[PDB]
Design a protein around this nucleic acid. Structure first.
Ligand code: ZN
Lengths: 369, 126, 54, 286, 204, 240, 121
RNA sequence: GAGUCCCAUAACCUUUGUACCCAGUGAGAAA
RNA sequence: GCGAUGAUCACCCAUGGGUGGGUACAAAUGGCAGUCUGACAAGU
RNA sequence: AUCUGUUUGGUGGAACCUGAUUAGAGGAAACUCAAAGAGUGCUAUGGUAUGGUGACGGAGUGCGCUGGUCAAGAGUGUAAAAGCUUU
């Protein structure tokens, strides 16, 4: 007698009622072993009486950990106390079929009138309801069971390994791989801005060569002016007002358009150095020893070209591409930097002190020469 | 480890050789003798004349394998499981099985000859 | 299509007659007729190791 | 799984009887959800009681064998346990009654000084014993009166008895002229059936738990299943490998038949040969 | 970008809704994927850079569509009959392909037909094969309306009328920037496209 | 290194051969644009313009399953729509190749017990969404019986002496009937007192005792000394 | 569980250090952390010994991940000074590796130590 | 009549300007 | 007051220059490199 | 080149010989008509079919049943116990 069946699953708990017992003595035979594959005969054995779904992925992860380490959770207590009849504790307990021989003791600790069975009969009843799944439940659950399985497997694994998204080096991979892209984008866009303003006067790109400073000053100068007080951010500003007096190049709609283009260049220019500050901060919280040793942008490009903090860590020290005496300080800094990246990757929440010591060692080595 | 068959057991009892002690002083090594379920089926099918042979094959020192096929043809089972794996000595006295086993290479063959066991295709016996 | 088979029709002949390109290479005996669906692709050696397969 | 929980070198001679118990100790409490109990008598003058670790419930988590050793002065030949109240009975040179607490027989219940070859307790009206003695005798005992009740002498020797589990006063004897006899306890002057189709001495008999058919293994190396109202064999099971079937039981499913032969093997059979054990849809069941 | 600027987080998505983005049928899919997902939970210090990138590419597309407005304006003020015939960005990459507007105007209509497909053209001339028929003019809306071999046919008639309108635009002096010659040429191409989409090679 | 190969479909579905002057076992790339363990890649331009899709070289000296494929196995059960339960997903080395052989419509459950390999498994399963990483001991399948349901093939690259019990437990829980059981047996890690043929014969006997019918074994000798792949199917009723 | 987890006790430590000294005499020992990771990614290594008391510990904890990837036994000796002294060099070493060789006169000893540290691990 | 949507919106070569060069090894080094 | 947490390992002058081979980036109204056909077709 | 005549590739397919097949060998079309095979899908669910032929149903009562608690009995144990067992 195997009277009830408890199937745990990511969407919730299910209590089934066993209608017909399968054979005990003929349980290894061919027809008994493939009646759990045929669905038309498995539905003669198993009937669903209850399904308590979870409150969400949080309670799903809680009950996944409790089922994993063999404990009865509160939702288990609720559904078992709803479904199982108040049998005696000394004479003919009610029989629940589980799949976990160390979850059984936790069930009898809470309900002493329940004896729990997980032997081969309960095992193949359980794998019958696992094999059929969504067909037994008659349509009563929200959410596809495999989609909840993907979510619960990823959540369980990240919990079990303590996956932190603060010390997640893919952020600094994508940050520096995007920062190089917008380096060349601000470069080519301000080159075209300088080209389109080159026939308004071709000396602003001679006095003010930096792309952002040129673009922000030409975003507000559109004419002659004189009144050269708020154009110092003043020898270069005085020379620029002198050149505006001696203007020596040649609209309205085109000039409005190149104003929109220079505003685009300014927006790219202050999204860069927001990103740079972000990745220096993320590099201090992800790789503090590397950034103490060779700097945040250099360590960022180092772990980008390595592919991950783990790949830079597990790489050999003689095979690190960092960027005579000048020839062998590269090798010294390489193997100290590999050491620092190993410290920084495999320590769990790192300090800065070993990056400090290795910086002291490499400055002692370079000052020795 | 040595796979026995039925005429090897019958010739062992007819020549008064113990199985594990005859194997040990033939090879000068520690032997594990194996009765497959088809060899055991053949000894049981031999009838009540061979009760002595059947309950000498029932011996805790003789371990026993579990063949998974239909029928009880021990020569087919021994040939298949020896040419699959080449980690077996075949102890037999059937002329046909002796010819099969000594035609497949790398398989030593043991047989009751005289008053003790002999071994042929094992090149390290002394 | 035949329009692309008429562009890669020569190196498929080279792969068919691999065995007589180098006098020291000596492949194992297959026939290798031209497969019905193929694709011509270029090896990306990455930016990790230099100078060896580069 | 067709595999032994445990084996036991129990005695030195033949283990001549064994049965199973739920031992009602009045100091300990029997743990029947994780231990099974079998006791067994042999010709080396011992009855031994063993416990078995059983994986059938997963409630718990253990000192398996030989919890006690009853001791007689002469050999034993049969044993059967009462289905309550800690009691069993052993036949041998004389038939004794025992309980699992005391290390000595409670009572000797022997008709005369003629030995006893077999024993069965009743299954309902559990206090009625029956026994086969080697003077071709079948004796009934009652345990209210703590005494024998009535015996009959037949032509040849009764090898075994089994009581009808559904009729409580009928039993079947299996004896050495090659047939079985269905007897009423209230009138032993006539058998109420004879099951005839064996050709050598019938070694063991057993009832279906439905009480509707019997199984009957004999010294010709074959077993036979009989409908209880007919008197000839409904079915014969044989095998070239099976020799001299000495023990037959009818499993509590009423669907399989366990036979123990004397080459060593214990074999399962279907009681209905053409019947498969899958669950059936209503079209194939109809 | 607009949806991650709107919500940010998955539980935030569970409490918010949106209809101005992601129209009316992907909402249940994003809500179900918000409820069950193999995705982690981000922090605020990198949600801030995610939001900065999202507003960055939103403003990028704003600049894209306003540059397209500028291109449409300069094109319909420089060569407006080509805009009325083949469209703004198609005529724009015609002019940008051939260099100057006068250098495109002094080219025959067959060149304006095959103008984009030079490598196919010159391989199909330097071995004796069949030349292309579409070129850069394949992405005109009229050739989009045609179907079969008559998109080669109206690529030809569209290049002829586009040569007419284009050299009118480049060589006129009393031009009015009003689309008149391009519009009558487009009416000619449209009723020609009608009369060769009305025929059918089946037999009725 | 910058050369050109021709990609050709293998006999096995989902895996390919790149013929050059040395031919390569090759799989499609599920996460295009990066390598996972430093293997080389092949980028084809298949024909809206054509798209650059790419392929990854499967290294038989760093993958027992690739050593089995290119030694010649009559039937892998890892197939392009299937579910594979990888046991002993020791890093993302072979699990990536099994993952993109199985494809976007199939699932690979990568079970591993150590934690730094688990961290690399999760960071690889981000860019390969068809990998469910399960950080748990495979000797107790009940501890993750809630996360996996009804796999089609089990692959076992565990290197423990209780291998056959681990394989049997995971198969009886999650494998379906007549599903695939691919085992990589390492003789020296099972036990080194006996020879390799003795331990392979014992492991095959253990599999058929746990009712997994072996179809095929391969020694995979030029890539690994004293290894084996045993391919069986989970018969569940009637190995006979 | 510490980071340097599968540490050996004193008898296993001295067995390990004796076979390390003999392999260092027989030119079968590659000593040092980056030589050890070089021979580990090359595949010529039978087991790696890390010392569990160097001044950082992640400096050699990079190696258990490599050993796990390639299924190589790894064991933690509790003295870098004694490990260097066994290696036969005049400095402490923090990691060493026994390279594979079949013309090696200590193959039985190396296999016995491999079995002991693998049943430990 | 007629091979572009399969990068003439491209590829390669040449020249001109800008920044560099001409990994493994594995116990020595210094006096 | 060392070290395995790593020692070590193209042409011309009495740190500095002269001359060029490869690397990337960008440019070129530099090159390859040359802008299809030409009178019928559809319907009744 | 009114030199050359080998190779590669296409076209062609005599004689002999070998193998297979034979109301000669095919091909194209489909919201065509039939004959069969394999796999997959679908709650595919009466272990003996509704709560009830006024012979019935509902309400209530009485008997029956379940669980824990307490008390009593009895066994066992013991100096006394305690404890444990009790269809
Ligand atoms: Zn066999």
């Amino acid at each position: 007698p195997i009277e009830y069946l408890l199937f745990e699953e990511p969407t919730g708990y299910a209590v089934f009622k066993v209608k017909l017992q399968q054979d005990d003595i003929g349980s290894r035979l061919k027809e008994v072993q493939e009646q759990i594959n045929d669905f038309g005969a498995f539905t003669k054995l198993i009937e669903l009486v209850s399904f308590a779904p979870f409150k969400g992925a949080a309670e799903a992860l809680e009950n996944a950990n409790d089922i994993s380490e063999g404990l009865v959770s509160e939702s288990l207590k609720a559904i078992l106390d709803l479904n199982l009849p108040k049998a005696s504790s000394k004479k003919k307990n009610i029989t629940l079929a589980i799949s976990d021989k160390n979850l059984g003791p936790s069930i009898k600790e809470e309900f002493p009138y329940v004896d729990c069975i997980s032997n081969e009969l309960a095992q193949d009843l359980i794998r019958g309801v696992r094999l059929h799944g969504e067909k037994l439940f008659k349509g009563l659950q929200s959410g596809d069971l495999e989609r909840a399985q993907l979510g619960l497997g990823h959540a369980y694994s990240r919990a079990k390994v303590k996956f932190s998204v603060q010390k997640n080096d893919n952020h600094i991979i994508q940050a520096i791989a995007l920062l190089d892209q917008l380096d060349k984008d601000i470069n080519t866009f301000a080159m075209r801005v300088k080209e389109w303003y080159g026939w308004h006067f071709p000396e602003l790109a001679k006095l003010v060569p930096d792309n952002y400073t040129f673009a922000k000053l030409v975003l507000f100068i559109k004419d002659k002016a004189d009144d050269s007080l708020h154009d110092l951010a003043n020898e270069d500003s005085g020379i620029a007002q002198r050149v505006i007096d001696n203007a020596r190049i040649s609209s309205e709609t085109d000039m409005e358009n190149v104003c929109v283009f220079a505003q685009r260049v300014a927006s790219l220019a202050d999204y860069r150095r927001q990103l740079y500050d972000y990745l220096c901060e993320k590099m201090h919280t992800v790789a503090p020893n590397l950034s103490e040793l060779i700097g945040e942008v250099i360590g960022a490009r180092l772990i980008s070209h390595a592919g991950s903090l783990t790949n830079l860590s597990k790489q050999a020290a003689s095979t690190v591409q960092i960027l005579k005496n000048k020839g062998r300080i590269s090798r010294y800094l390489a193997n100290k930097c590999s050491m620092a990246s190993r410290i920084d990757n495999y320590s769990e929440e790192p300090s800065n002190v070993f990056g400090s010591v290795l910086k002291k060692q490499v400055e002692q080595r370079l000052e020795f020469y | 480890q040595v796979l026995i068959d039925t005429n090897f057991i019958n010739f062992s009892i007819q020549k008064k050789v113990d199985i594990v002690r005859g194997m040990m002083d033939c090879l000068l090594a520690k032997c594990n003798p194996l009765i497959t379920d088809c060899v055991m089926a053949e000894l049981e099918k031999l009838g009540p004349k061979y009760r002595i042979a059947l309950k000498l094959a029932r011996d805790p020192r003789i371990k026993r394998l579990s063949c998974s096929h239909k029928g009880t043809y021990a020569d087919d089972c021994l040939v298949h499981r020896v040419l699959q794996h080449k980690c077996y000595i075949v102890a037999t006295n059937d002329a046909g099985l002796k010819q099969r086993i000594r035609k497949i290479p790398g398989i030593p063959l043991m047989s009751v000859g005289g008053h003790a066991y002999v071994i042929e295709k094992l090149p390290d016996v002394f | 299509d035949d329009n692309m088979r008429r562009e890669v029709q020569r190196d498929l002949l080279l792969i068919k007659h691999r065995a007589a390109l180098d006098p020291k290479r000596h492949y194992k005996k297959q026939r290798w007729e031209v497969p019905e669906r193929f694709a011509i692709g270029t090896i990306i050696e990455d930016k990790s190791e230099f100078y060896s397969s580069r | 799984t067709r595999e032994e929980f445990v084996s036991f070198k129990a005695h030195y001679g033949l283990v001549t009887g064994l049965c199973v118990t739920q031992p009602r100790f009045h100091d300990k409490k029997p743990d029947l959800k994780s231990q099974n109990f079998m006791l067994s008598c042999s010709d080396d003058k011992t009855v031994k009681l063993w416990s078995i670790n059983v994986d059938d419930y997963s409630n718990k988590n253990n000192e398996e064998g030989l919890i006690r050793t009853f001791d007689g002065e002469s050999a034993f030949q049969g044993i059967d346990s009462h289905r309550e109240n800690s009691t069993f009975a052993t036949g041998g040179a004389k038939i004794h009654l025992w309980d699992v607490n005391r290390l000595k027989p409670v009572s000797d219940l022997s008709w005369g000084a003629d030995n006893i070859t077999s024993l069965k307790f009743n299954q309902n009206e559990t206090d009625i014993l029956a026994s086969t003695g080697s003077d071709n005798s079948i004796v009934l005992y009652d345990l209210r009166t703590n005494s024998p009740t009535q015996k009959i002498v037949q032509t040849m020797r009764t090898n075994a008895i089994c009581w009808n589990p559904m009729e409580a006063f009928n039993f079947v004897t299996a004896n050495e002229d090659h047939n079985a006899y269905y007897y009423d306890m209230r009138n032993l002057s006539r058998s109420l059936n004879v099951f005839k189709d064996h050709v050598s001495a019938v070694m063991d008999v057993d009832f279906s738990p439905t009480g509707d058919e019997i199984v009957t293994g004999s010294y010709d190396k074959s077993i036979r299943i009989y409908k209880t109202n007919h008197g000839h064999s409904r079915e014969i099971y044989h095998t070239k490998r099976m020799q001299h079937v000495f023990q037959v039981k009818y499993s509590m499913d009423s669907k399989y038949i366990i036979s123990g032969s004397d080459d060593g093997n214990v074999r399962l059979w279907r009681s209905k040969a053409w019947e498969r054990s899958n669950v059936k849809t209503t079209r194939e069941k109809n | 970008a607009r949806i991650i600027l709107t919500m940010g987080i998955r539980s935030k998505a569970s409490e918010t809704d949106l209809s101005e983005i992601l129209p009316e049928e992907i909402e249940e899919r994003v809500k179900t994927a918000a409820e069950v997902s193999m995705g982690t939970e981000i922090t605020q210090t990198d949600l801030d850079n995610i939001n900065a990138l999202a507003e960055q590419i939103v403003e990028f597309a704003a600049y894209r569509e306003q540059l397209s407005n500028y291109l449409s304006a300069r094109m319909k003020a420089i060569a407006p009959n080509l805009t009325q015939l083949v469209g703004e960005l198609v005529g724009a990459r015609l002019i940008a392909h051939s260099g100057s507007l006068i250098s495109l105007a002094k080219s025959p209509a067959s060149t304006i037909q095959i103008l984009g497909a030079e490598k196919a053209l010159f391989r199909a001339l330097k071995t004796k094969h069949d030349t292309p028929k579409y070129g850069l003019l394949y992405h005109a809306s009229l050739v989009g309306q045609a179907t079969g071999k008559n998109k080669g046919k109206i690529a030809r008639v569209l290049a002829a009328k586009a040569a007419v309108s284009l050299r009118y635009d480049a060589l006129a002096e009393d031009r009015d920037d009003s689309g008149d010659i391009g519009l009558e040429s487009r009416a000619k191409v449209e009723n020609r496209l009608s009369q060769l989409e009305g025929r059918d090679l089946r037999t009725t | 290194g910058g050369a050109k190969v021709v990609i050709e479909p293998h006999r096995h579905a989902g895996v390919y051969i790149a013929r050059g002057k040395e031919d390569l076992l090759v799989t499609k790339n599920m996460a295009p644009g990066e390598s996972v363990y430093g293997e080389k890649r092949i980028s084809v331009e298949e024909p809206v313009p054509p798209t650059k899709v790419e392929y990854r070289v499967w290294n038989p000296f760093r993958s027992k399953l690739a050593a089995g494929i290119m030694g010649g196995l009559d039937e892998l059960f890892i197939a392009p729509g299937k579910k594979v339960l990888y046991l002993g997903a020791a890093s993302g080395t072979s699990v990536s190749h099994v993952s993109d052989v199985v494809g976007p419509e199939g699932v690979v459950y990568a079970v591993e017990f150590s934690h730094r390999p688990g961290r690399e498994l999760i960071s690889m399963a981000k860019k390969r969404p068809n990998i469910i990483p399960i950080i748990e001991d495979a000797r107790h399948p009940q501890k993750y019986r809630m996360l996996i349901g009804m796999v089609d093939c089990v692959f076992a690259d565990v290197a423990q002496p209780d291998q056959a019990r681990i394989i049997a437990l995971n198969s009886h829980m999650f494998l379906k009937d007549q599903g695939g059981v691919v085992i990589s047996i390492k003789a020296n890690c099972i036990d080194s007192t006996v020879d390799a043929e003795t331990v392979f014969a014992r492991e095959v006997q253990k599999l058929r005792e746990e009712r997994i019918k072996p179809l095929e074994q391969l020694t995979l000798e030029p890539y690994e000394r004293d290894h084996c792949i045993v391919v069986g199917r989970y018969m569940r009723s009637g190995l006979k | 569980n510490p980071k340097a987890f599968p540490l050996a006790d004193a008898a296993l430590t001295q067995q390990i250090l004796d076979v390390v000294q003999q392999a260092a005499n027989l030119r079968q020992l590659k000593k040092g952390a980056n030589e050890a990771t070089k021979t580990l990614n090359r595949g010529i290594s039978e087991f790696i010994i890390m010392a569990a008391d160097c001044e950082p510990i992640e400096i050699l904890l990079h190696l258990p991940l490599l050993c796990e990837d390639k299924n190589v036994p790894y064991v933690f000796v509790p003295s870098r000074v004694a490990l260097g002294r066994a290696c036969g060099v005049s400095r402490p070493v923090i990691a060493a590796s026994i390279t594979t060789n079949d013309a090696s006169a200590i193959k039985t000893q190396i296999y016995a130590v491999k079995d002991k540290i693998e049943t430990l691990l």
